[PDB]
């Protein structure tokens, strides 16, 4: 099961991630900087963005979501409840369940048999070296290169400064002396078209890394540690997990702001085994990109399903013309 | 000489007390690449002159000078004879060399 | 065998192959610097690289993904299957395959019929004094002269700085003197336009190095030990094994960056036997002297066979345009 | 076939004939004093060097790769077959044929008759007195003068770090009890322009040293002891063999770095008897020495064929332009 | 030698007992070539002066000693007063000795 | 004399029982003929300070000792009154002898 | 006394069972002009240590002795106090003198 | 009797078979009239052993003798309290002696 979605969004007057202007009134959303052909030499330029460390906690915080109300939701450390980022510390020679079990960080078989987020997300304690790589990848957030390319300028920051004002049990707007918390506090919002290569590897949930695989007799076999039915409860929440993606439920200061979404156009491919990762919607080209290799994909034979919304994707390959993004997950999840 | 008051100013703008923060036209000052970008953010820096006028007297600070007419009139050529951003760099620079100053504003 | 890749790729929002500081909060990414003419005398210039090992261990860890699925590939080492770069330590004399058979560390034509991994990418023992040369040699990822000629400055590092955070049951933050594991570090990030010119000599695949050629009568024969047909599947999943090469799995920190990939244009150059190694595509002419040095290969009486992505390579010169990657794979393996 | 070749290269991001380190996790490149006039007084700088060893043992490789193919190609010695550079040493009474044939170490008129390698390159057996002079002369591989004489520093060593991290069935990095193979291995790399100025007297090939010239009656013959055929294959694999050397197959440590190599420009020179050696590359005004060495010799009675590439050399001496190395090499294959 | 003072500030960022730790100014200023880049950095490292003010009295330490006047109208002939790059690095990573030692700064 | 302090630094980040391997920077120390890359040098050892200070306790020894900062206010006027390099070698070379031995580093 | 630990720490450089032979370092610590010549020639010997190190465990041979820091600081003290070029020709070719002995080690 | 043993090392150098001669050194070691010139003189005696000691095996007699460290440091303790020549000249003609006697080396 690996899946591989992207497209292009919009994101409108939105402060997600921002770099917080180095710990000051004036805080300012991070940028990052990206070349473009301008059919005159690659030049660079500056443009705000989403990093994908983002992308990948609210990844477990959707997976979170969407497992606790299965009915094998009791297998989660206690600080996935409370949206821990952090899967294991320093000085943290054990772990604690939501139900207060304690957990050793040796033969990490156990470890992927009673915890469900380091299975997914992976984990590392440094005391005992034991490692996990992250069964899902995140693509960074930048703006569509079309898009950059056409604005030529329009920073794309509004610097909107929001102030808070208190006084105290008089009524009194104070001076310095008192302090009174009186500060300025602007914020800059960012506005555009971006693009989203989010993808996820499910074929080894579950199966530990030492040994993915075990032979009986010259035979391979999934070494599946957990019973079945939860390593398919594990892959339904994950596959659900992206529905508070597409639908505005990313970024810092969700409460303030909760930015303007709305998916413009997408192209997923499910498959059974390993795939080509299918290429970022940061290029303006990427649409004959992704039919060239889907179709290239059928030709040498891979059983890939493919998957458009707003994306024309020719007329001879097989493609399901998808209506929303939480019937998709719907698609996706009957194949199991 | 000549760069001691508009930094005198622009340090002015931002220190101790003087509870008005705009980090962002200093920082487009000094970072800016053309005649355009230093022209606006000298405007926007001196947008600024009538609510520091206004604050000197509410915490009883001593007046701020105002920059002449004669600094930004002379910069209106010093600025307008160059043809590579290399050259106007560390004009911004020096437009920013008193811009964090342990100056004594608010003796 | 002997396939030669050259080619211009575009990469954005990465911070592959970092050296991590060794364990500080501020990492940085591999930096190494080269000579342009610049037409006014030759300069050197620091820019981020990525150095060979990372496209090596990669290729490894491919060519074993896509390996493990063919029915000969139970013969494949035991920590191969956890995408281990290790071969061999310095004093074990025995390893351990994938259905934990033991093999020994002497007499390499046995070692390379019972480990395929280890035939392809070679491997030393110091104990007991074997050795096998490398037959997959990776080059660097470069930015391009043309590109690196017409930015004069812009460093394109951003150094985006991202923390973690960690709260007990509680919800504390906690302070220093409880620890908590609350760091908050950086990362540095990196985009331009790179060259690859990464070379197989899959000729040799099973042959053992003591022995290349067999003399029955005055007659050479190749020395293979392997079946026929096992050797076939050792050819096509190491030349399967470039699909995710240019997908954009190469690197580190893949689970949260998974660079913006895609693939500017390529030539390729399959041939029989040995032949000139392809020019990198650093440089800003490489066009024309791979143009002319295919032209009097062909001439001179070589089997020279060669595809090409989004360049010219003139009209006097066949060639087959391919209008992807693994369309490309799909051609190397059509003569088997 | 007294032929001479020396050039400009563009040798980047090489780790080319190491110091090796001797064991300290930190090995350095080679390093060598090059005097310089500066305009103000001979001073000597440090420089980054690949000794003509490496440029003779990869020109062995080539053309035993190259003499393989030949039907005549079970003439060699059996470790040449896998690159031994080694001929005799310490007592070596006997020698091995390619097919198993036992060869003696006395009248060395047969020794070249049966092992082309030992007749091209040379050897020498301390326990008989027989020995040869190699037919191939190679000269220090050093960057140019002006190029360091306009890089005022810069040392060009950027000292990257590697790792290799090994991880057990339980998945845990260990300590030095189980020694867990964990080490850092740095290596310094280097980028310039350097030169080279590889010289072939193959008109000697095939004739012992002892006697080189028979008279008849009072008229000299060349004393050829292998068939005319054998001597014309021979000469026509140590021409090829320059193939893999301004390819990119020079050096060592070929598998992880593959240096990006480029030919700047070249000189060639082929005659039919004695002539000057060519000048080297390294020196700013090479060309000019050049155009006054082959016109003074053209005009003193010598049958001088110049090639070049890259350099003008006037008009008034004809030249031909190649526009690679390998039509250079069938343009010295059609004048055999 | 008005070194001292802006060392003691260039270190104060970097130095252990605060919660700051970003030392990509230093590395900056480290590497400087050109007139522009140097004073650049070195400003980008002032401009966290007062993180470093509102910080200091969390953790009851003294607050930090912001460079004096005199060291920055020092600085300035004593850049320009050069040509030669030769002689521009030794004063464009002479700060640095000082960000990294092992005095008392928070008593 | 303010060299054996300085030596015990660059020993710690050469000396065993440690993960980090730096030869290159007691290199760059050794053979480094002029006054600006032996600053250089002094740089390059002294970068990585917070690396040994939160790797000394990892395995329990106590941790390293920086040279004082009278140690640092000496070598700048030790330096400056070398004028021939003739002498500018032999504090480099003893500095750099002081970076190998075979002391108790830290138990 | 004092100098036969260095002595033999030369002579494992260049004694049998350990395949370095550095005829070179040895020869440059014997012939010295000048005492900055003769620490550069003792940096180079001393700078092969860690080889030797685990060159020693390598085959289960014992570990040789480095030099201590006061037999280092002592060597110093006495560099710089010889001043012409007669005793420090004396003292250059005493410490090299039995790097080609007949010691007993790596038994 | 610790000056036979010196004496048969130095008449390895010349005497039958032994296929390199070095008179040169021996006559050094005799002429030598500062007790410095007699401390080349031995170290050039000395710097061919390797010589010798792996080319004694290529003919298969008896490998020589090369000096034990105890009786070089004696050599060189005695160094130091000959403040005459008059001295020097009968112990390096002692020493230089045993060079040309009837040593039976390897038979």
Request: charged content about 25%; overall charge neutral; aromatic content about 8%.
């Given at each position: 099961?690996?899946?591989?979605?992207?497209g292009?969004?919009?994101?409108?007057?939105?402060?997600?991630?921002a770099?917080?202007?180095?710990?000051t009134?004036?805080?300012?959303?991070?940028?990052?900087?990206?070349?473009?052909?301008?059919?005159?030499?690659?030049?660079?330029?500056?443009?705000?963005?989403?990093t994908?460390?983002?992308?990948?906690?609210?990844?477990?915080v959707?997976?979170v979501?969407?497992?606790?109300?299965?009915?094998?939701?009791?297998?989660?450390?206690?600080?996935?409840?409370?949206?821990?980022?952090?899967?294991?510390?320093q000085?943290?020679?054990?772990?604690?369940?939501?139900?207060?079990?304690?957990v050793?960080?040796?033969?990490?078989?156990?470890?992927?048999?009673?915890?469900?987020?380091?299975?997914?997300?992976?984990?590392?304690?440094?005391?005992?070296?034991?490692?996990?790589?992250?069964?899902?990848?995140?693509?960074?957030?930048?703006?569509?290169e079309?898009?950059?390319?056409?604005?030529?300028?329009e920073?794309?920051?509004?610097?909107?400064?929001?102030?808070?004002?208190?006084?105290?049990?008089?009524?009194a707007?104070?001076?310095?002396?008192?302090?009174?918390?009186?500060?300025?506090?602007?914020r800059?919002?960012?506005?555009?078209?971006?693009?989203?290569?989010?993808?996820?590897?499910?074929?080894?949930?579950?199966?530990?890394?030492g040994?993915?695989?075990?032979?009986?007799?010259?035979?391979?076999?999934?070494?599946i540690?957990?019973?079945?039915?939860?390593?398919?409860?594990?892959?339904?929440?994950?596959?659900?997990?992206?529905?508070?993606?597409?639908?505005?439920y990313?970024?810092?200061?969700?409460?303030?702001?909760?930015?303007?979404?709305?998916?413009?156009?997408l192209?997923?491919?499910?498959?059974?085994?390993?795939?080509?990762?299918?290429?970022?919607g940061?290029?303006?080209?990427?649409?004959?990109?992704?039919?060239?290799?889907?179709?290239?994909?059928?030709?040498?034979?891979?059983?890939?399903?493919?998957?458009?919304?707003?994306?024309?994707?020719?007329?001879?390959?097989?493609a399901?013309?998808?209506?929303?993004?939480?019937?998709?997950?719907?698609?996706?999840?009957?194949?199991? | 000489?000549?760069?001691?008051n508009?930094?005198?100013?622009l340090?002015?703008?931002?220190?101790?007390?003087?509870?008005?923060?705009?980090?962002?036209?200093?920082?487009?000052?000094?970072?800016?690449?053309?005649?355009e970008?230093?022209?606006?953010?000298?405007?926007?820096?001196?947008?600024?002159?009538?609510?520091?006028?206004?604050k000197?007297?509410?915490?009883?600070?001593?007046?701020?000078?105002?920059?002449?007419?004669?600094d930004?009139?002379?910069?209106?050529?010093?600025?307008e004879?160059?043809?590579?951003?290399?050259?106007?760099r560390?004009?911004?620079?020096?437009?920013?060399?008193?811009?964090?100053?342990?100056?004594?504003?608010?003796?």
């Amino acid at each position: 099961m690996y899946v591989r979605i992207s497209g292009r969004i919009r994101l409108n007057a939105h402060s997600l991630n921002a770099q917080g202007g180095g710990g000051t009134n004036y805080i300012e959303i991070t940028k990052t900087k990206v070349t473009v052909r301008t059919e005159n030499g690659w030049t660079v330029v500056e443009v705000p963005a989403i990093t994908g460390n983002m992308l990948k906690h609210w990844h477990f915080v959707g997976f979170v979501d969407y497992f606790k109300t299965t009915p094998y939701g009791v297998n989660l450390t206690e600080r996935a409840l409370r949206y821990n980022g952090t899967r294991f510390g320093q000085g943290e020679t054990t772990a604690t369940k939501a139900n207060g079990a304690t957990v050793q960080l040796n033969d990490e078989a156990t470890i992927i048999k009673e915890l469900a987020d380091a299975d997914v997300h992976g984990f590392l304690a440094p005391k005992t070296g034991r490692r996990r790589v992250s069964l899902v990848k995140a693509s960074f957030i930048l703006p569509t290169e079309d898009f950059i390319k056409e604005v030529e300028g329009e920073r794309l920051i509004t610097a909107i400064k929001h102030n808070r004002v208190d006084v105290d049990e008089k009524g009194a707007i104070g001076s310095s002396k008192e302090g009174t918390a009186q500060m300025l506090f602007s914020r800059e919002y960012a506005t555009g078209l971006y693009g989203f290569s989010i993808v996820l590897d499910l074929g080894l949930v579950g199966i530990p890394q030492g040994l993915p695989v075990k032979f009986e007799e010259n035979q391979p076999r999934p070494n599946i540690v957990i019973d079945p039915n939860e390593r398919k409860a594990r892959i339904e929440s994950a596959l659900k997990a992206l529905i508070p993606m597409l639908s505005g439920y990313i970024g810092a200061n969700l409460a303030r702001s909760f930015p303007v979404f709305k998916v413009e156009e997408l192209v997923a491919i499910a498959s059974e085994g390993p795939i080509p990762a299918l290429v970022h919607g940061f290029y303006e080209d990427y649409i004959e990109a992704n039919r060239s290799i889907i179709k290239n994909a059928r030709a040498l034979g891979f059983n890939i399903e493919v998957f458009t919304y707003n994306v024309d994707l020719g007329e001879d390959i097989e493609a399901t013309k998808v209506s929303s993004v939480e019937e998709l997950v719907a698609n996706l999840v009957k194949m199991v | 000489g000549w760069i001691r008051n508009i930094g005198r100013y622009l340090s002015y703008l931002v220190d101790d007390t003087f509870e008005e923060y705009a980090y962002d036209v200093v920082d487009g000052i000094a970072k800016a690449r053309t005649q355009e970008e230093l022209l606006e953010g000298v405007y926007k820096a001196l947008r600024l002159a009538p609510k520091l006028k206004k604050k000197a007297e509410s915490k009883g600070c001593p007046p701020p000078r105002i920059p002449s007419p004669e600094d930004i009139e002379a910069l209106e050529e010093k600025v307008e004879q160059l043809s590579n951003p290399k050259d106007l760099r560390k004009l911004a620079v020096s437009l920013a060399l008193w811009a964090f100053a342990s100056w004594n504003n608010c003796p």
